[PDB]
Design an enzyme around this catalytic site. Structure first.
Site, PDB file in Angstrom:
ATOM      1  N   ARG A 148       0.972  -1.344   0.102  1.00  0.00           N
ATOM      2  CA  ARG A 148      -0.047  -0.050   0.032  1.00  0.00           C
ATOM      3  C   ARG A 148       0.824   1.350  -0.027  1.00  0.00           C
ATOM      4  NH1 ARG A 148      -3.856   1.627   4.792  1.00  0.00           N
ATOM      5  NH2 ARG A 148      -2.039   2.911   5.676  1.00  0.00           N
ATOM      6  N   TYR A 160      -4.073  10.862   6.094  1.00  0.00           N
ATOM      7  CA  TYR A 160      -4.262   9.541   6.467  1.00  0.00           C
ATOM      8  C   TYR A 160      -2.976   8.758   6.007  1.00  0.00           C
ATOM      9  CZ  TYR A 160      -4.801   4.789   6.890  1.00  0.00           C
ATOM     10  OH  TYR A 160      -4.649   3.427   7.298  1.00  0.00           O
ATOM     11  N   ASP A 211      -5.422   3.359   0.068  1.00  0.00           N
ATOM     12  CA  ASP A 211      -6.485   3.498   1.014  1.00  0.00           C
ATOM     13  C   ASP A 211      -6.970   4.907   0.787  1.00  0.00           C
ATOM     14  OD1 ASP A 211      -8.587   3.660   3.106  1.00  0.00           O
ATOM     15  OD2 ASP A 211      -7.147   2.584   4.282  1.00  0.00           O
ATOM     16  N   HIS A 213      -9.683   6.249   2.577  1.00  0.00           N
ATOM     17  CA  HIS A 213      -9.987   6.513   3.813  1.00  0.00           C
ATOM     18  C   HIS A 213     -11.152   7.536   4.005  1.00  0.00           C
ATOM     19  CE1 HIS A 213      -8.898   6.357   8.084  1.00  0.00           C
ATOM     20  NE2 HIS A 213      -8.303   5.151   7.947  1.00  0.00           N
ATOM     21  N   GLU A 237      -9.337   1.736  -1.981  1.00  0.00           N
ATOM     22  CA  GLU A 237     -10.166   1.224  -0.542  1.00  0.00           C
ATOM     23  C   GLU A 237     -10.739   2.294   0.005  1.00  0.00           C
ATOM     24  OE1 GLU A 237      -7.216  -0.515   2.183  1.00  0.00           O
ATOM     25  OE2 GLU A 237      -8.589   0.114   4.052  1.00  0.00           O
ATOM     26  N   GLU A 263     -13.559  -2.411   6.092  1.00  0.00           N
ATOM     27  CA  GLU A 263     -12.964  -2.600   7.382  1.00  0.00           C
ATOM     28  C   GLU A 263     -13.854  -2.407   8.756  1.00  0.00           C
ATOM     29  OE1 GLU A 263      -9.808   0.026   6.412  1.00  0.00           O
ATOM     30  OE2 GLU A 263     -10.180   1.134   8.344  1.00  0.00           O
ATOM     31  N   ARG A 284     -13.370  -6.107   2.821  1.00  0.00           N
ATOM     32  CA  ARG A 284     -12.436  -5.840   3.910  1.00  0.00           C
ATOM     33  C   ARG A 284     -12.903  -6.180   5.343  1.00  0.00           C
ATOM     34  NH1 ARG A 284      -7.850  -4.565   4.004  1.00  0.00           N
ATOM     35  NH2 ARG A 284      -7.916  -2.512   5.188  1.00  0.00           N
ATOM     36  N   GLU A 340      -4.053  -7.800   4.848  1.00  0.00           N
ATOM     37  CA  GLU A 340      -3.546  -6.824   5.534  1.00  0.00           C
ATOM     38  C   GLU A 340      -2.454  -7.403   6.485  1.00  0.00           C
ATOM     39  OE1 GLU A 340      -5.647  -3.244   6.651  1.00  0.00           O
ATOM     40  OE2 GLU A 340      -3.819  -2.104   6.367  1.00  0.00           O
ATOM     41  N   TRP A 403     -12.414  11.128   9.143  1.00  0.00           N
ATOM     42  CA  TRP A 403     -11.141  10.641   9.156  1.00  0.00           C
ATOM     43  C   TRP A 403     -10.765   9.574   8.489  1.00  0.00           C
ATOM     44  CZ3 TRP A 403      -8.609   6.982  11.613  1.00  0.00           C
ATOM     45  CH2 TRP A 403      -7.076   6.835  11.344  1.00  0.00           C
TER      46      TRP A 403
HETATM   47 MG   LIG Z   1      -8.357   1.141   5.697  1.00  0.00          MG
END
Ligand SMILES: [Mg+2]
Ligand SMILES: [Cl-]
Ligand SMILES: [Cl-]
Ligand SMILES: [Mg+2]
Ligand SMILES: [Mg+2]
Ligand SMILES: [Mg+2]
Lengths: 403, 403
Positions: A148, A160, A211, A213, A237, A263, A284, A340, A403
């Site tokens: 990543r 991030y 990501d 985010h 992602e 996630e 995820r 991950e 965030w």
């Molecule tokens: Mg993530």
């Protein structure tokens, strides 16, 4: 019959907070499960010890699915990250116990080995593009097959996934949430160059991931995905907050960059539309935050009907107990995509001795009975809980953002 | 600028458990909010006092929406009953403070009075049809314009909503969940007779309601709705678990009996498909469990675009602080349907002194500034927390089911 005689919740902070459930059965067989919910840890502690645990006592630990349904339906209020994380901890501990009774590693109960090991991705980051790429060069040298990349946004002080930590990223760093400032435009205009440069230096065989985010709207994520097509990312992602699952329809209509999300998902329902409309390529969701091996196995089966592979989250706030459980799960399904893997601190590895190992860019769970992990209570006791929050993020005008 | 200087969580059990947040501002203005989550109460206590509350200190209490967003987004894991109930407590308390600063009852800030009072339903129950109907006759003499009817199922020892309590129903009655046994077929074959008899005795002007309490599949609920059409129910509630919102499509295709659902919903997303496809007529979600006045006002607006009215849940596990907030909300919207009203115990009313009154089948929140409710801390301290769970339900073969 494997009567449960005790169930205890242990809180420790060997570098960051982890919560663990340890279940003991009558003849001394024990199991552990992770219950860590980053930045809201103690809510799960209470959900388990004040509410769920009293019903565990005297139950037959063999009844994994019935115990799962008992807690999922019995809570009345259904699901949510607190409840499903607490349930995950019970489920993991019960599978650990099942494997020990069977004399087999948990993956042997779930279908057996479907691969030689579990391919991971690592976490390259830096303030400038050249900094990030220098880190990625390191990960390639370390044998990672997938990496990543995250990089600073020009004109923003922070973003991030960029920090002084390089083998991991530990954002829950303060005793009140750290405040950040965001500009979507500054990011959209800058991040594709990262991937252009990465391909020039790293070549085309390594898998590259990113990501977002949670910071875009669908039409913005559509644009970003198109801009990244030339660099053939493994996935893009969490491009947009996913409560409105139909949001991904616009992304999917405009870009062929593969999409990952989930996630934070607590249950199948958070992903059902995404999966059934083929809006994503990787799910995820984890054994930790989506209700354990029991539930993630069912979800993975549904995903496989729609070309969705697993891409389980693996940040540091998933303890070695989750990692063990995740590896057993990952080993035993056809539709594995990637795992991950952020490194834990040496103190964390000492508190949670485990059998899983890393070699040649792959994890393998080992072949010990059960999950192949435990908590050292004496060492855990030397690291007390320390309140620590995830950061928050606001737009340039002060608007509360994601965030 | 109204600086928050203190925020305390109080737990008391004046006949049943309630959790309350009390926020104090610099110059002494306070607000209260309900945070009670029946059977999982201590998890919200921790989510508030160990995690959210530290961020409240020093903030400007006027910033209701920003504080809402800060907690909703800032937790990272998003939503769920624990987080949204904690957030509701904060939101209620902030609106209470706002009314006090403004010198106005909260409903005056939200749109003003849209009706003379808030029409409620009461709770008739009995083991036989005759018993249930005699209870309904009592409620009708007490001036109730709407009455829920629940009755024993022939050949089952127990069922939802039937107990020795007659002005309310208090099912969280044991220190481990009470176990029940269920037969769908026995219920489907028997319950329409209750409403046939009710119409013969009570007539056609009184509104009659029924809570199915999660025990059917969609095709079963379709059948029950058809069987109940001759009796013109006000609504048929929670007929099927609603995680799969498309489940209500089959019910809607087959019956014109009006449908209600949602007391357990934590956010707009749990109802979005139900509302946008016109699958329900009444949304049961509350200021307590779906994130406060701020969130329910937004949801009601969306509901009104699709002919959906509010039918807020009002069982005993919503404290008088919730009922005050619910009444201010109910007074100030066009698309109000009905308000559920179970009686609290005298001890509960004394711990939570309130301005709201009951007359001619309606509640009215009163005209004090703020919510018109407070917590008597000295009295609250005389009643310590007592663990108590909601019941559970299993099929005849032992299968874990929905209570
Ligand atoms: Mg993530
Ligand atoms: Cl939850
Ligand atoms: Cl939650
Ligand atoms: Mg560090
Ligand atoms: Mg009683
Ligand atoms: Mg109900």
């Amino acid at each position: 019959m494997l009567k449960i005689i005790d169930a205890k919740v242990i809180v420790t902070c060997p570098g960051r907070n982890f919560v663990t459930l340890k279940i003991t059965t009558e003849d001394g067989i024990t199991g552990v499960g992770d219950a860590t919910l980053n930045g809201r840890e103690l809510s799960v502690v209470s959900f388990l010890q004040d509410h769920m645990v009293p019903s565990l006592i005297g139950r037959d630990a063999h009844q994994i699915e019935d115990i799962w349904q008992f807690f999922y339906r019995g809570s009345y209020w259904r699901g949510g990250p607190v409840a499903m994380t607490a349930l995950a901890a019970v489920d993991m501990a019960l599978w650990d116990i099942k494997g020990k009774v069977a004399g087999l590693p948990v993956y042997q109960l779930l279908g057996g080995a479907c691969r030689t090991g579990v391919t991971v991705y690592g976490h390259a980051n830096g303030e400038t593009i050249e900094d990030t790429i220098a880190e990625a060069v390191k990960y390639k040298a370390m044998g990672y097959k997938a990496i990543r990349l995250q990089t600073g946004v020009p004109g923003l002080a922070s973003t991030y996934g960029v920090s002084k930590d390089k083998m991991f990223y530990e954002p829950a760093d303060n005793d009140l949430p750290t405040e950040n400032i965001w500009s979507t435009a500054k990011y959209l205009n800058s991040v594709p160059k990262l991937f252009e440069r990465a391909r020039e230096v790293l070549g085309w065989d390594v898998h590259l991931l990113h990501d977002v985010h949670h910071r875009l709207t669908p039409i913005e994520a559509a644009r970003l995905g198109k801009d990244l097509e030339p660099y053939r990312l493994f996935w893009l992602e969490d491009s947009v907050p996913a409560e409105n699952q139909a949001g991904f329809r616009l992304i999917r209509q405009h870009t062929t960059t593969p999409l990952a999300v989930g996630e934070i998902f607590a249950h199948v329902w958070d992903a059902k539309q995404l999966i059934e409309e083929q809006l994503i390529d990787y799910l995820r969701a984890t054994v930790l935050h989506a209700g354990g091996i029991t539930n993630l196995k069912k979800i993975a089966a549904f995903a496989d009907l729609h070309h969705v592979k697993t891409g389980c989250h693996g940040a540091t706030d998933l303890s070695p107990v989750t990692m063990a459980a995740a590896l057993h799960f990952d080993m035993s399904i056809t539709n594995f995509g990637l795992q991950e893997y952020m490194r834990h601190t040496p103190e964390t590895d000492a508190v949670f001795p485990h059998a899983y190992t890393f070699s040649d860019g792959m994890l393998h769970p080992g072949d010990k009975p059960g999950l192949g992990v435990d908590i050292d209570e004496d060492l855990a006791a030397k690291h007390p809980y320390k309140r620590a929050y995830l950061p928050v993020n606001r737009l340039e005008d002060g608007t509360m953002f994601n965030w």
